[PDB]
Amino acid sequence: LNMRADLETYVFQDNLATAMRRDGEIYQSIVNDIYDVPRNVTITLEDG
Amino acid sequence: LNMRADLETYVFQDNLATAMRRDGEIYQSIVNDIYDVPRNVTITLEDG
Numbered sequence: 001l002n003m004r005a006d007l008e009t010y011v012f013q014d015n016l017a018t019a020m021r022r023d024g025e026i027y028q029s030i031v032n033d034i035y036d037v038p039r040n041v042t043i044t045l046e047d048g
Numbered sequence: 049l050n051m052r053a054d055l056e057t058y059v060f061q062d063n064l065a066t067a068m069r070r071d072g073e074i075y076q077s078i079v080n081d082i083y084d085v086p087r088n089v090t091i092t093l094e095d096g
Contacts, residue, residue: 029089
C-alpha cells in the first residue's frame with residue numbers, strides 16, 4: 001500500500017525534477033498537414 | 049544483488065580497458081560517417 005503511495009509522488013516528482021515528459025496522443029514530426037475536425041479518440045490518422 | 053553490482057562495475061571497467069566490440073545489431077554495417085537527414089521519426093537505412 002505504501003509502495004503505491006510512494007509511486008503516486010514518484011510521478012509528481014519525476015515529471016518536475018527531471019522534467020519534460022509531456023503526454024498526449026499526437027504525431028511528433030515538424031511540418032504537418034491540416035485540420036483537427038474529426039480528431040478525438042482515434043489511433044492512426046484523421047490526417048497526417 | 050551484489051553480483052548484479054559486479055556486472056555494473058564490469059561494464060564500466062571492461063569497456064574502457066578491453067574495449068572494442070561496437071555494433072548496431074550484430075553488424076555495424078553502413079553509414080559511413082554521419083547522416084543528418086531523418087524522414088519522420090522512423091530510421092531506415094538512413095542512420096541505421
